[PDB]
Amino acid sequence: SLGPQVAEGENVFGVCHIFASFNDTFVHVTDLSGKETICRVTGGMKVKADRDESSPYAAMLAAQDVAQRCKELGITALHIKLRATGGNRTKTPGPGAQSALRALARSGMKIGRIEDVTPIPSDSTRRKGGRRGRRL
């Protein structure tokens, strides 16, 4: 765990990846390439109930751990890449987003740029489900 920088002169950047499904939520903090990672923790490691794998409190219990594991290594600022499930399936980011971003911004980081990287296809294949569709 090393740092060559000075504090107020500049802000050392990293970048996160906020995956947000309807049943699970990733946070994956990597570097500017994305090739080199720093830490990764899921929602599922912390709550022993699979019906709230993606409760909003289950993202806060892992985002606090990420900003706790990263302050020992010297990162002040982060970029954000937000990302739904994408594809031919849905495209609405679930509820585990707006309380995990505030959950680490409140936990003392320097938020940079915000964008969307949801994989929107130009021309989809066929979604799983019949012509009358999943009825229940």
């Binding site: 707006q98 971003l101 505030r102 409140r106 003392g108 320097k110 938020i111 940079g112």
Partner: peptide
């Protein structure tokens, strides 16, 4: 949360 983004932003 935009109040707490706009404060903690650069």
């Amino acid at each position: 949360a935009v109040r707490d983004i706009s404060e903690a932003s650069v």
